[PDB]
Amino acid sequence: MNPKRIRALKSGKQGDGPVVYWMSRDQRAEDNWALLFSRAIAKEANVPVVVVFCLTDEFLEAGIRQYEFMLKGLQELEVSLSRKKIPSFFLRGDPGEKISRFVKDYNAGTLVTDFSPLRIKNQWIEKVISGISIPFFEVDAHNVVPCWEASQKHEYAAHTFRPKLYALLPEFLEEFPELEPNSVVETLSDVLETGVKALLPERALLKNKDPLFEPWHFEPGEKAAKKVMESFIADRLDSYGALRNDPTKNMLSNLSPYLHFGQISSQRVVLEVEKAESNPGSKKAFLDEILIWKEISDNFCYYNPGYDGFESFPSWAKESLNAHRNDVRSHIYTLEEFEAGKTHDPLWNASQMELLSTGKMHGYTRMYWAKKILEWSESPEKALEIAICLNDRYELDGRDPNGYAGIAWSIGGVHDRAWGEREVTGKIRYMSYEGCKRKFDVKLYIEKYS
Ligand SMILES: Cc1cc2nc3c(=O)[nH]c(=O)nc-3n(C[C@H](O)[C@H](O)[C@H](O)COP(=O)(O)OP(=O)(O)OC[C@H]3O[C@@H](n4cnc5c(N)ncnc54)[C@H](O)[C@@H]3O)c2cc1C
């Protein structure tokens, strides 16, 4: 195991109790580096390993679609973890008070947690460090190359982050070792019942008092991601590089909700893809999305504290947008109109309806749905707020570094370039509705999501 995957957050007095793994971003038993790093340090200490998950108070900021998808996987994870004699403990409340009290009550020896560059995670780490006296480590279990090792600074483009991540693939793209089993605070069903009950008033309903979310598209679970990845390699991998810009076809891997919650490892997906025989043009297209653009999103959120603000934009984009702030917008809609899909664009309305109904809108339409927010907002800062709101609320893969890096590109050209100067939008890359008609059947995408 590579010691570059682990980092030291706080040196402390080594206890004699079980090494506690604070699982958060990577909710899986297989291909979890942090779970394997926590098992080896537990073996060297002749002490059992225990995992802990914190159901935070901010779960009401999302919806039932994210609460049910994440809990259903944990109901499956508790079984698999018990098959290796690893008990799981699910605390409900603030991590700063729950982790520090659990470590003290159980005489923990070492604390381990997965890596997440989001601001809400660094908020929890700041609180737990002030109330613990044992060693505290963090492990990058999400990225193939550790986020602090792929680059020591923010990469302004994909062509400059590609040769750094690819040159480090021969060292970090490796097979996973077996999760050795151990030598020897309520039911998750009750947390789902009471949690959904508090989320029913804010459930996305239609006019007929019926909900919008269709929860039969992506079944959750670690075994569920096993079948989705196998179905993509066998059926959709050969045709990926040619129909990934066509939202009328379901030609994507559909692994993003399993990737966000950590129910599947991107390293495991790359391993099976790299050994699969298919079109080299389609293989390069998928690896560039799951390796480059995915791990550069963690690069954007790690080295830019204001990743969700106007200040993280490139210097050319801030000057371009500022030079067009006072331009008369074509039309201005409110958050309630963008949320209900009540605009003058049927293609945009169809992209919002797919976001409302499935919780996973096509990748190409995500670029159109977010850029049109900037064209129909009072200011770039308002377009950022509206885009991040509708993304984090309805996307099953929402509240992920991929979203903020994808939103900062549509509204601020992050990891892009300067194009022709237009009004309102400035030099940000513009995508027209007529340009989408010559790209795919827009009429089929609209009629599909009435
Ligand atoms: C406005 C906007 C919002 C987005 N919101 C999210 C979000 O909330 N959560 C989220 O995980 N992704 C988000 N993305 C990135 C991207 O759209 C989705 O990751 C992708 O559509 C996921 O669906 P898929 O797995 O079926 O596509 P696939 O083509 O099968 O992609 C496979 C995986 O590669 C990664 N990937 C692919 N494309 C990108 C990309 N452009 N950026 C980063 N990673 C990528 C993803 O991990 C993805 O799951 C957003 C993009 C935009 C433009």
Write the layout of secondary structure elements.
Blueprint lengths: L5 E5 L8 E5 L9 H12 L4 E7 L8 H20 L4 E5 L2 H11 L5 E4 L4 H11 L6 E4 L7 H4 L7 H10 L1 H4 L15 H12 L22 H15 L3 H4 L12 H5 L5 H10 L4 H24 L11 H8 L12 H6 L5 H13 L4 H13 L4 H15 L6 H12 L20 H5 L4 H7 L2
Parallel strand pairs: 2-3, 2-5, 3-4, 5-6
Antiparallel strand pairs: 1-6
Bound molecules: flavin-adenine dinucleotide (FAD).
The site of flavin-adenine dinucleotide has 27 residues, from helix 11, helix 13, helix 17 and helix 19.
Binned strand content:
5-15%
Globular, elongated, flat, extended or rod-shaped: what is the shape?
A: globular
Q: How many domains?
A: 3
Largest sheet, described in full? 6 strands, mixed
The assigned structural class equals: alpha/beta
SSE order: EEHEHEHEHEHHHHHHHHHHHHHHHHH
| Gap from first CA to last CA | 51 Å
Descriptive notes:
With 450 residues, the protein is α/β, with parallel strands linked by helices. The chain has 3 domains: 141 residues, no CATH class; 168 residues, no CATH class; 141 residues, no CATH class. It is 49% helix and 7% strand. It is built from 21 helices and 6 strands. A 6-stranded mixed sheet has the order 1-6-5-2-3-4. Strand 5, helix 4 and strand 6 form a beta-alpha-beta unit. The longest helix has 24 residues. The termini are far apart. The structure holds flavin-adenine dinucleotide. Flavin-adenine dinucleotide binds next to helix 11, helix 13, helix 17 and helix 19. The site of flavin-adenine dinucleotide (FAD) has 27 residues, from helix 11, helix 13, helix 17 and helix 19. This is Deoxyribodipyrimidine photo-lyase. One of its GO terms (biological process) is photoreactive repair. Its EC number is 4.1.99.3. Belongs to the DNA photolyase class-2 family.
